[model samples]
Target: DVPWYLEGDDEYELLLDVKGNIKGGSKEALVSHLTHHLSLDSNFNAVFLLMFSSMMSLGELISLLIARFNIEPPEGLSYEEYNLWVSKKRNPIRLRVINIMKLLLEKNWSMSYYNEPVLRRWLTFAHSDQVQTYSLGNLLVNYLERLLRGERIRDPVIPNTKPPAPLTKGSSLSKKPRVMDIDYVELARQLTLREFKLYCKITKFACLAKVWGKKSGLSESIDSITQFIKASNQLTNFVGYMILRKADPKKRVQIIRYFIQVADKCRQYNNFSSMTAIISALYSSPIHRLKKTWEYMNADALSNLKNMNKLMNSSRNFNEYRDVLKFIGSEPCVPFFGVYLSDLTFVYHGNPDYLYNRTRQVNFAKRAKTSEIVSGIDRFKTTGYNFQEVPEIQKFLDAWFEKCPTIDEQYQISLNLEPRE
Candidate 1:
């Protein structure tokens, strides 16, 4: 009898106030309202919008509906009949409720869910021997298990429409489309979405910030974050490679400025990592040393380059970078991983796990600091970019980045370009 509306975003207005926050109401009434509306067959966009709202904690949202979500198969049912009841009616709603849980936990995973009483009962109910096919239980358990064991749970594949294009070039023309031929804003849009996929997978445990090679179950979190670092490095190298590949001084300046344009677009997306990558690439040892390249660069572009560096500068421990994040609310944005990685490094190593001097007491203070920084980064992960996915661009970047010259190789190319004694 409910969920009468569909096929439009008006549901968001129905649930949230004019200010775009969750609407205020009595808990019972609100829970009933949300539970019914959310269970409609295709109401997932509403759920997606709600999770990214970041208005309240996952448990805080789920707590009110525990009474309703704590569902049971019909009381008098025989053994087989019970499974039918769950399979036919109850499991679908349970799946809907659990999807909400999965969304929040995936956004910012934690150690808290394991200890919840409702969740414990849920785990057993999902895994109990009488359960038939394991779809519902498996979805819930696998999500929990992977997070608990420090394994990566993949994001759903974006339903991108544009299939990839073949990478073939005419035999004589080995080069990709010229730097100027590409659309800077579109390139940045694709790059932002690509990096955002990697950014969202990082975990709080990445605070340790070391990718121990042993794979002893603990390395997974650290490895996840280090992959993001590695991705940024590749982007930096790609920028340098693209610029250095061109022989003419005038073309090199255009490439550099094109990257600057893309970086600015990344900044608009609040994607600082790639922005850092491009800026760092421009200022890299080989790229910066070429005098003729700078001679070709216009004043405004040069100053914009300098100011972008100023924004990303590590002086005072990235004060400007942190401020940029602080200025924005919990809207979807990928931060500069470079700054946060070092911060995690500092927090993890700076303080002893236990207060060594003060009777070796467990140091709650350090824990508080660590918790604050970890959650600070995770808050940004709660939402994602509003940009549409383009598979062709993603594929193009993948192939394009592979052509990046090694750092030593790139340095040699710069020497040829400048011929400095």
Candidate 2:
């Protein structure tokens, strides 16, 4: 009942080559030749000759014999019984032929079997509901070998392995993996920073380039990627070379701007260490203008912080002093210098000069006890004076100053303090 043309074009010729004038051959001659060539043993071949002679017409028996050469029938069923018992034997192969087909497809193997009628017939027989457990390849190869020897398979041996069902249209197997199509490129563009990070982590650069290669060559594609990195603000040193080598002027400028913005913001927040590292790296980059711009900004910021500190100290104590400190904490300060010293002298060690000299310009209802310490200055800015502004305040200030140690010394002292992260 299987369709005839499903086998490839040469399937009939292959069959003819195998059968080779069996029509005029006597039964014993047929039996002897076929048994010796096709059957596992002649006893098995004899079993088939007896079954066919008892139950089938000459034409029907020959057709059944030809079918045997191509497929393995179910167990305990002779060729005639299998054909005659079609309704009872229509089970599908269980192992899956389609998976094998899929493997062949991925490896770019030929599938001319789709064009052969005998191959088609074999596929149908192998795919039968009852004969669902046969391997199409094994059956075809074995049958071809028997046919070549001028033997018709009279007794078909059922295979243990089952083939899976044929693949349907529009399944994953139907479509091959393709290069970067326009739609896929658009999708790649739309991915979020987090998604892009994950994609880059998982995907190889070569694969990404291959996909991009479909639309443009390596140079043009790299330019496009650099432009995307500029626009997305997700560029990193890891892939910077691939971008810089090919990006156009416009794209380069955009990335420079992004880097400067990150550096500037970090500087504005007194994230000095972070600011220093980013700007220093940018200054070393090929963008000469970026280095010039950061140099100007850095000098101006430092001068402003210093001048503003001078003006605020001249005016009033509490507000100006507190505000200046707060400003220094917020604005960009130089790395490894006066900011840390000022913080140590004022914030940590609680030096009275930071309190009295720094705070004097701002009006506090009462003078800060040590305001006169700056009447003379020392290199370390350590001052000697007595203060009686608030009766017992001088004693308190003296005690505080005498007991307090610089951060560096305190750090050496606290080396025994606690465990560190």
Candidate 3:
């Protein structure tokens, strides 16, 4: 039944039996043919051709026979190193490795007889470093195979053990030092005025004082400041006295006169720092009551004015300067010399004429008190007259209004907070 063209063209060798009709061959016969062809490693091209043809036939047959079956092909593990395989356009080898990896990842085979070394041997030949695409593909495939066989892919680089170290010092164990808790407020109070002044001179102390003042009233905070000044006085009194004694009478008079002018300027302009400077200037002058006890105008006592000026210039911003000035102005006239002038000026210029003028407005029989017109800090409250209705005070209100202009905001914030909405 052979065709005429195929007969006697060459010596034909029939090595295997042709069972039944080739077209009518069963699945078992086809499988046997496939296995025999694939096992022939010497004729690799022929084996590949046979395997490809048989696999194609099996796929077609299975597709037609299966009605509702879902076939899940084996999934390989992802090998990020294999990305270069796709870059080289070597899709065939790339596809085969992917399929093999998918099968391994899917757990389609057992690890016991996986033959990872044999697989890696084949892979190593294909994966020469010169041919990166093929090499990378092989490396990836081999890695997956090794992993599938439960073999370590990478060795541990560092050991998980501790090293020897000293446990004691000089054959004796030393105890850790214990930290003692301190009460800062009590410690500060116990400090000598000299110590406290040095603390004030430290840079951080100003910030601490500022933060403390923000949370407390001026009356409450002034004690710390007074303490600092007292300390500085104790430390520098001797040097101050000697300077006064050493200086000629004319020089002493000039120094005193200069202080008076400075005091006048501070009194006129409400310069709190200048006022403090003038106060310290007096101590350096012949007026210091402690002149007999501690003598020579020490540079340190004179330095208070300079330090106060520098601090006020550097640390006291506009609002802070104003607050500090307000506090200084509030002190009694004796403590803060010439403070009455500032108080009078502040009241006269701060109020409106209609409110301050009493003579023209007295026909109403009701009048505003000096307390109402002037801030309580002026200490006019100490004068016995009832602030609610003092006639002479109200009479001069017009004249006072003529001298004063702008209202102080501190007085305004106070007045506003006292009243209900």
Candidate 4:
């Protein structure tokens, strides 16, 4: 029979059944029972609660029995004495509590469970000394928190890759020789596919959901977000660089046409991040100011470019873009993350960190809402696409994608075209 605090609940019944099965069973039975019943699930909080309550009950019972029997020893006993006393006197109940906690920790020590909000909260509670005087909970908490703080987990699904070498001037190895007679559609397809791959990797990092509020620890996700933004900026700069470097007016016009076609492909595939980067590159001062190129563009391509520009316009705070995203509705899409981050930044700053009127608590509801927005972005990462690569386009991307292009360089390119008119 269970005590009042542990009775009359589904979790209690589950725990009792496992406990009964393990009592007279072999070590294999104990492991099997624990592995089956204590796995991380939707009922994680209830399971954790049951385990925590049981440990606390045993600890309190030991304390009560010691006090009742007046078990006093020599004054100023060493740490070894205290440890020995706990092992000898409280062996049965203490070992049982520790074993339950060990199983709980074993089940949840993964990247998947670490990202779960409810399970993380339960983990925090279980790590408290209220559960046990000597506990594995603290060690488990540290291990899981370290992972949350950007320690890499062993995931067979995503193989590790070497970090990209830093860009440097006159590095021949970093630059690929220019290839001739490039196929525009094939180039577009490969670039879009590469962008998709990067997006999926960024989503799997799981840091975006943790760094919004003051209390949420900004450093937790900053490294991942910084890398993501840097990649986007480089892609944008590469588009502009390709257009500006073309000396032949005919080739420049062709480049613009190809870019417009690539934007269309991005739209078809719902790759909004890459699509917006391409559009911004097209509208850069160096490209948009080229009246000759504009004149050469066909009516259909120009109209498509105009519509794409309108859809991504910043008017009314990107309402048109939001409408399109809403319409897509769970179909895999790569969002322009800058807009969403800006929205979250606004929400983070506008709201108080604590709800003073409502019990002086941390504004967790707000943080959870922001996490949901990030999770919405993450959902698309799970969907798979058959995207093939073109080595020539990949080479072009590597050669031309500068990480830090100055505004002055863009102005100089525009100046070279206008010539003090």
Candidate 5:
């Protein structure tokens, strides 16, 4: 059951209001009332009601009838039997209710249903019985939030089913681990170049930019979002992979220094997107919590990290990053694709696709404004660095690209980084 306090919440109150109208009120009154209170389209209201009807809890039903409708069930009828009876009934409401449930359950709740607070709340409570631990409602909310913010959810990996082979005195796995002594500068250069190529490839698909707005003709071809997410995931995985690969704490510190240097080199090459990704990986909960490891970082490196963070800060709509870009002038640089897309999303939602005057006209002003952003992305189409790629580092990049760790896996690796004292 949901918490007692949630019963008096706005979402529950709205549900009760909907129930009252659905029972005895006219269809016209229900439509107008739902529109006025829920602020959803009429089609959506019909779907919402259908979904709500199907998810009706026994407690909710009894409360609605006795408290709101002032109706009493027969003396021997329990809420359970009443609910069971309704489930077996062959009526118009039951048919539509089953159809809506099937539709929503099939899609794991469509984007439209996820966006509606009232519907989300009702569905969450209704489905609570399926899982005993952790609240599905909260999980769904968190999942939706991450999805909207363009984060990927990783599938859980199965654990080993069989016992591992016993360790032998001379086993290869028991040998001393190799130290990560690669050339940090050369590695950073190669990675920056490779990622820059990927970024350009994704943005060059001009159709991707068209997918940002509602009236845009290219929503179906929005591969850029997936590409961008993969690029970001790879960066974090690279950091975690390096840190966890070497078991020695001293060597881990060295890896951290190498990563910091890589970030510095990324900035120097004007690859702010990769630079931001590297910084984020370093600052992720697992890596950043290593106070002992960080203690070994020199003051200068720490200062450099602080400055980079400030530059990448999204405060005031990333004013610091914008200023640095402006200072770079026409120099080729890779803008953070996520930030740019977020800006495009804002513009897309805040304005209408077409304008109406005495004579209606296409929203040329909106188009031009959005085009300016797309044009900014286009400027990097031909951008490339002078650095030559290293075969060794390119091989490493290929591996990370193939098996980019999910956020959960990254955190699990982080847990191995010197457990809490």
Candidate 6:
């Protein structure tokens, strides 16, 4: 059930179980399926895979299988031996295998997808004389060739990694502005744009390794999912800090109302990052513990606040919010992406990396599942907001973040605002 390979079908070649999980087909038939799907001519299917059988540009599936085949032709076929096999009589499967290696690496030349072992094996196989003649020879002697040969194929971003730019103090053209001076709608729009930029930079590595595995540390991409999480926390603290910055209950209620308006606007702007943060700040011990402040809030404000809370409810595994993301359709959004992180981590740890007790085939089932969730995250990456940026409001946000207090400082300030019962 997990790896889907040990007792794989060598007969009828149905690769999935009745529940529709990929059990995968016989190794001999795997290539035939690959060729059949690729033959779907010009108007290509956008997805990397189709269910009953497997086909994902054969990228994920083949990647896992290369290790299965021991990274060379069966029987340890070398270049000379393989070339001799070619002369003896063409092997369609092996010919497909040659292009499979070529095309798969072609698929990988983008960014951040650096699996060194298979790719290093591909380099020597590709560099040899016969393979030089395959597919216009771009795979062998080209810029991609230069890219692989130019330096270590280590991820450039990973080599020199750190968090995004720190909030900097900047020259301003105005006096200290009151919270009311900020246009809540413009503020939401500005915040949405800023967060979307970070959301788009998130990668599979960030989701699996940085956010889930916690191995990536702060040495991740400039604006990864890690930064996105950090941004939410920064705003959460900033909101509560501003609420209790000066100790007063009545005005604190007023501040709460206004921030709710901003959070509500974030909902319309589809910036869940800030909206959730604003709500998180509202529900924090520092803010919620204020018996006096919440009492001053009117029915409408309090009810609207609860609506946002319900929207984020953990009930039914967040199906309400999940529906919201689905219906947003053509609308661009930054979701409560932590849910997405949860989905990926579940898939990663749930399945074994390799298939079968004997054969070294990679578990395509797991890779496909990761790719499935990754597609959802990448879906809204570029469908960005149409909002215009505002320097003043953005600067205000930066200033607030710059002054954002730490966890300990937050509780202390909370006590200053509303002392112990």
Name the candidate that leads on TM-score: 6
lDDT for residue 3 in candidate 6, whole number 0-100: 21
Off by over 4 Å in 5: 1-179, 203-214, 356-361
Which of candidates 2 and 6 reaches a greater lDDT? 6
Best-first order by lDDT: 1, 6, 4, 5, 3, 2
> Taking the tens digit of each residue's C-alpha lDDT, what string does model 5 give over 1-421?
5222212112321212243332212222332233332133444444334323223322332233222211123456567765643343212232333333333344323222233354444445434543213333355445545545545441112233552322221122222322244455665666666777666655422332344433443323456557766777788777766776667778778888778888887888788888888888788877788777888888988888888888888765777888877666545566677677767677777766434331122233344455556556656654355554555556656666676676557677767767877
- For every candidate in turn, the CA RMSD to the true structure comes to 13.3, 37.5, 38.5, 12.8, 19.8, 8.8
Task: Compose the digit string of candidate 1's lDDT tens values, residues 1-421.
Answer: 3221212122332334365433332334334444543345233223322222122333445564454455554456677766655555455555555554555456544443333554555456446543325455567676656655656553433433553332322232324556455568777877888899888887754543252122111222366776787788888888999888888889888899999988987888888888988998898889999788889888888888887888888876777877788887756688887776577568656865434453323333443454456566667776666565656556667776777876667888888788877
Candidate 2, 27-55: lDDT as tens digits: 33332233232123333233233223222
lDDT tens string, model 6, 1-421? 3222212222355356576644554444444444331232111112222221222222345454343323233466667766754443243334445554455445433334344454555555556565566663454445345555544221111113342332322233255766656666666777787788777777654564543333222123435665787888888887888788756788888888988998998998788778988988898888888898888899999988899988887655777788888887656788888788778777777876546643434355655676678568766765566554667667777788878886567887778767886
Q: How far is candidate 2 from the true structure (C-alpha RMSD, Å)?
A: 37.5
Q: Kindly give the stretch of ten consecutive residues in candidate 3 with the minimal lDDT sum.
A: 361-370
The local lDDT score (0 to 100) that residue 381 gets in candidate 1 is 70
What are the Cα lDDT values of the candidates?
0.61, 0.30, 0.31, 0.53, 0.53, 0.60
- Model 4 residue runs over 4 Å out of place are 1-180, 203-214, 327-332, 357-359
Each candidate: how many clashes? 0, 30, 22, 0, 0, 1
Give model 1's TM-score versus the native structure: 0.59
Q: lDDT by residue for model 4 over 61-146, one digit each (tens)?
A: 22332232233334565777756544443343334444544554454222433444544554554466644455665665665466
Please, what is the TM-score per model? Answer: 0.59, 0.17, 0.18, 0.59, 0.54, 0.72
* TM-score head-to-head 4 vs 6, winner: 6
- State the TM-score for model 6: 0.72
Best by lDDT: 1
